[PDB]
Symmetry: D3
Subunit: 322 residues, 6 copies
């Protein structure tokens, strides 16, 4: 109930997409629990516990699709709950929250570096890589492959409505990587000159399906058509535990004004609806490998990743639950 | 040569895409040769012949990909050239041109209403139709189905870079037709709820291939993946003669600042190139039917349409050449 | 208005499927106009003309899907109308009707013999042929191939709900042809031992799509999956002229009691609906050749067949129209 | 050996398909070994051991294709065999058998309710579900989605030769669920209006393949053609151990008179054979998920389910052998 | 009965593949007929007519698969037979033969030249072209493209068993075209670097299937897999008139010593059979265009080449027949 | 530094392909290490350890593509290195090496035997089997099946460039198995008569792709096209641990004189380059099963073979490294 404003700002910024990208939203949420814990004026363990739960709920209710966010909160809160129910004093519980958040953040960073190291080995001298949206994990791969001295070019799709491709383009450019910027529509037209595809992931399912920025499935489709390897770069905390037990991932429908700006949209007739899904789902047949910090896998081994790391917790309710 | 201003203004406006759509471009090309003949001050027939030769060369060098443009110029100038070589005096030559051009414009209008009526019979009540870009022909089909009392909805894809989807959305919505506007990247995500795809053409080749707005081949591809019918609404003047003798269609590369505005692009790193192809090429196997003013065809019958309407002219030179 | 009962019985028998099969229904309808004409008590040409029109309407309104029926009636009635409007006396008009019907019947028979002769050449010694429903044209092929001394076996699908396969099985057996009878569901399971598929057609469209007995499209689908040639055996009067101008073929929905017998069906809860489509539509991609009396064609050449034989009449209303 | 009558009556009833469905067969197999142990008059443990050995051999030789049967027998007899070899006295051996069998029956029931709850989460409100044959597991999924308030309709395919579709149609309709009954041949025609396919399994192989009622592979095939999800509701006791070591599953050929009744078939020509396979084999690539009581898997994870639940037993002999 | 030396040498050189390549073979058979007429010591019309009839049969009975050969003998003998039946005297008949063969040969050289010109237009600067066997018409395309100043590289598949690829590689090298030579099995491995596939044909059928050197089908298949264009370079006398009326093309089975040499094969166990198909059949779905001397067709328009250039003769027997 | 004669002969025999076949090569490298330890005149532990390290590098540097080789050197040197670091004396170290090589070699012979037994079960009486190259493990399957009394026939693809298929054909003949020998290009032509495809592997990756003799991929592709099962017979030491961490397998490019002999190649134009890839890569989607000595897997479970038998060593450097 005495929730610090750093939690409230992180939430608003997640919603507004000032903080965006699956890994980043996750790190931002770990962070927010950290700050809440650091700054809490609680006197009993029970008071802090309550704050961490209510803050976790606020943070969870921001954006649904990327499972990295709930996974970050679970990492922190599985540990916090266990300390709490085990009778931890106020300070043991504060540190358990703070240090758990710190680990997630630190492991998130090492996981992305490691993915780049692993992914890069699948890039070859002279490769033309097509990507989509802005993925820290995808970019780690392309960036490392350049640093090894491979001469790559990267086709960057624009990624409407939010123009994520601009970010990716400028960022790749600044590491010395040449870029070809194209609109989303042109992905089939350039698939013939493309040697590899490398994209990120918001959530990966028990069957190997990849939920990622709207348009990912199209690029994968025509990549398959063309026999261009589709490689997805993704941390194990992108894997979705609830889909083990039959859960479908919700696809976020964002405001129509991200597609068509406010001033214009209200001049339009009432019988036009603008629909703005932030993600689509890419079937496993169309994915060559998923690149995790633990190694290369075929998409269908998503279940192993889920079994050995996340399944244990599916008997329990969420660690923030009241 | 004394070229009248309406010839130059039309060429500017085609190049700038102020005038756009392969059907319109073609009518305006004819309209321009008509205005040249109307206002010419030529004394001799040879004087006027030369004006129209040159006028045609100006118009032909505007935009290369939609063969409708040269087929309009040809429709007028084969006639003008035969009048002139067969000894026509001046005012005979002036009317051959005027009248040939009025013929093309009125047949063009006719063909579109006719493609509407034919193509509508392949629209079923309840259908959800996905379309791309803005095509007077495709719209004729959708609008004619609506006027028949069928309850349709049209999925209008945005169509970057130039936003042609906005024109389409507003146009259809203004005839009463419910519209759903989405980004091009959302085509696959919404292909499951789509019953029919209806699109235009700029060029159609001997072998069946359809050159139409960039992103057309993606929509068609994922329509095939899902067994949604891809119907191309296209006049016979969209069919490309030189492809019979082995020609590939030039795919127009338009200025990059149509993608990223000048103000923003000049601030971007030197090693990003923006590539802006205006069109892509959809293979025949992803096309179900081509709705011409002469009836429904399989796309492989493109060659029949060309054999019987264009072949004769191929042993000759272009009717505006020296 | 003074319509003979032979017209009324032929109609009832077409509806009830006592007379069934596309070619046969067509011959039966030609026949019926013949008898009407033979037995008419008309005294003026105008009186007979009226009878032939009203009889054509009755016969046309029996079953929609197989276009052979309207084509048979057009063959007879294009000729009758032309005699009539050209001032034929009563007897000239009677004979025009009678003799036209006779030609259609005679040409129908020669067309089926000729298809068998042509089709059989595509069967090879040792072939295992899978078929579907009961097609006179298909059977003509298999029968001729045996008579040439090729040792074939024919897999006969049962063809529910009406058990057409029983007819085909007994009929092939009686020519010396060994038969393997299987239920419809088993077609994929036996496609591996199948060398050829040979089926009939009720209506063939401008784009090469084949409308035929329910389940045809499944057999073709898994045939394609397996690279087994799908050959359709079909007379040129199976080709559908209205689909040139964008008409979709109606798919006949027959009584639910053909699926589930009356005594049983009325014991069932109201919230079960039985749906009984008599046909499905098979796309051209899944058809290797159509075998007509005029020769082997790829499915997509359906338009040539339609252009050169049926298109001339599409400017006119139906020759029975009032 | 003194085999009790309920062992023989159950074997007759499995063979005749009076008792049917791989789940039921398996429970009744266990039920029979339970009744044998209940009523045995054995004095020694060795006497009873031998009765159960023989009882198991009788039950195992009824119907070969659904591995659920032997997995039930194994579940009981690995336990009984270990009790006996580990010196158990008589009434200990009698209870090991009884209790092992009650265990299997109650776990089987549990697994089905559980597969209902998991699989329902992949059913979305509004969905039209196509199913095949009659599967308690598939029905558990569909019924559980309905109880959640989702408005579904189920397309029940008839399922020749034995008409299992009638059982399914009546069952689902009796829980309130709207049913559409069609013939197996209509599967493709109605795949366009279908959102999800839900079916059972009799055996599932190491590599992912699903053996289920004849016609299953057709439905799955055309589901893939249209990108409709194929979900297999199947317990872990449906998974086939011997396939790990290279075994192919025997596909049961049932008496031809189930297709064509004795009265009719005896009148048919000698060179028609009726072939009645009871099952077909659907490849893994046409399967989206397998819903087990342990959660959603990709079909290629069949091998994991077998490794961790069945592999150990493969170096041993069958637990009812000499 | 009095057949010239040359007809025998031509025949034998064709049998042993000393003269080879569909077009060349046909030229050699026209040449033979031409020399039979030149050197005839016949004095009656009927004596010559009989020499030419027999000469034809000898030639037609060398090698079955390439229809070019009978199409050449028909070109000559149709004309010879029309003259002989007109009552043409000896010297008129002798010239009919002599001239018709020269007309055939000259039109053949012209077609291959024109195919080069037309086909070259579909080659683009920087293209890598995979070919197969040695096709004069395929080579015309490649050579003309290279002469146009396009920097192409050609991948020459070795083409077992007769090592045809060595001839192709040496030939293209000799015009200054960089060749990559590879074994047949490597065609998929290098399909990713291939932009275009260009190959010949021995026979093209009524449905658009292409019969060419063994392996042609594997290359078309993996080319389709990767969306590389397959372009067939083929004179209109490669199209097979018999296939219109149902015939299948005979696939010539040549000597096993062309595979395993005689000195080695004789030492091998009896129970190894060496099979040497000289050709295979590529379906039209894997073929993008056929480049003929009349233009570009989709494979499905082969029926038109046939309808319009050959169908007239099918009514009749082969000209050389009695 | 003091390396035995035999290590050099083994190395050179492997380089020149005198010793060939992935499994055999590996046995030859274990053998070499075994003879280095046997014949060492070293007197300190460290002297031997250094001989074996160097011997290993020599061997690993012969042929890159078949991972069996390093997996054998690892089997031995992991064990040798654990001993040397335990402080093992000279003779203990010498035995560690000698025994570990014998263990490797004996386990290899056992695996190939067990693969035969397991793989044979998926062969059925009357099967026609296409194979490629010469794989000891593929042959084990075929031989065991034939020994079981199944009347099989084997199609042996010739396998250029090194004529591997002659070895296979002679070998299978020698066990009494009828062979059909065909050139590589004929694999599609005979895929219709093929029931089963059985081939070896040199390296199998973490995502299930198979690296085997050049051509393997063309056969898998057309086998998939026709729904023929592709079964790979492969010892678990064919699985590539490096591919888990991102590596690509190096495709060995061997001498051009293995393609075109030296006496002939030297006469050829400079501008023909002869490319000799010894291997290609088959994707997992075209592979039905991998038959290992631990059982049948889908190709996607290759990651499990790896996770569980090799992943432990990836943390560390190669045993022979300093
Ligand atoms: N050198 C290599 N090492 C490991 N995997 C490879 C290599 N080359 C190709 N692949 C894989 O092999 C398959 C190639 O398939 P395609 O893209 O269809 O050629 C894919 O599954 C790739 O991941
Ligand atoms: O974790 P990293 O690799 O940064 O990003 C993964 C994915 O998350 C992003 O979505 P959004 O911008 O949050 O809507 C993009 O879809 C991207 O592919
Ligand atoms: O001729 P209509 O049917 O109106 O449209 C035909 C096509 O021409 C347009 O190109 P652009 O906007 O001129 O670049 C669009 O691609 C459209 O589909
Ligand atoms: O075990 P449950 O899930 O109820 O059904 C599993 C399968 O077993 C049945 O076979 P049969 O009717 O015994 O021949 C059907 O094929 C059904 O899908
Ligand atoms: O007429 P051109 O285009 O030269 O060759 C056509 C085809 O004929 C040849 O066969 P063969 O060498 O006669 O056995 C080759 O297969 C070639 O592709
Ligand atoms: O171990 P086994 O199963 O015998 O053979 C495995 C594979 O290794 C061989 O290559 P190479 O002859 O070494 O170049 C063949 O390609 C074969 O399929
Ligand atoms: K590419
Ligand atoms: K749809
Ligand atoms: K659907």
């Amino acid at each position: 109930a005495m929730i610090v404003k750093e939690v409230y700002e992180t939430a608003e910024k997640i919603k507004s997409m000032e903080i965006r990208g699956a890994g980043r939203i996750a790190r931002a949420a770990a962070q927010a629990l950290m700050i809440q814990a650091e700054k809490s004026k609680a006197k009993e363990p029970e008071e802090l516990w309550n704050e961490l739960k209510v803050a976790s709920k606020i943070l969870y209710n921001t954006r649904p699709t990327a499972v990295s966010l709930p996974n970050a909160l679970r990492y922190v809160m599985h540990r916090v709950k266990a300390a709490y129910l085990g009778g931890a004093d106020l300070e043991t519980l504060r540190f358990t929250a703070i240090n758990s958040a710190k680990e997630f953040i630190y492991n998130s960073e090492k996981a992305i570096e490691r993915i780049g190291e692993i992914g890069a080995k699948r890039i070859e001298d002279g490769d033309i890589i097509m990507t989509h949206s802005h993925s820290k994990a995808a970019i780690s791969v392309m960036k490392k492959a350049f640093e090894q001295g491979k001469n790559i070019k990267v086709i960057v799709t624009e990624t409407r409505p939010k123009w994520q491709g601009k970010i990716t383009a400028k960022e790749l450019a600044s590491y010395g990587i040449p870029v070809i910027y194209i609109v989303d529509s042109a992905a089939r037209h350039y698939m013939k000159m493309t040697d590899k595809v490398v994209m990120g992931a918001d959530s990966i399912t028990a069957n190997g399906a990849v939920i990622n920025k709207i348009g990912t499935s199209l690029i994968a489709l025509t990549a398959k058509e063309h026999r261009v390897w589709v490689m997805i770069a993704a941390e194990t905390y992108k894997f979705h535990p609830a889909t083990m037990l039959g859960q479908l991932v919700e696809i976020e429908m964002r405001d129509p004004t991200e597609v068509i700006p406010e001033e214009e949209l209200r001049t339009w007739p009432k019988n036009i609806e603008v629909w703005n899904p932030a993600f689509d789902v890419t079937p496993p047949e169309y994915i060559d490998v998923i690149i995790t910090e633990r190694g290369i896998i075929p998409p269908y081994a998503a279940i192993d990743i889920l079994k050995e790391e996340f399944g244990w917790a599916l008997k329990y309710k969420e660690p923030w639950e009241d």
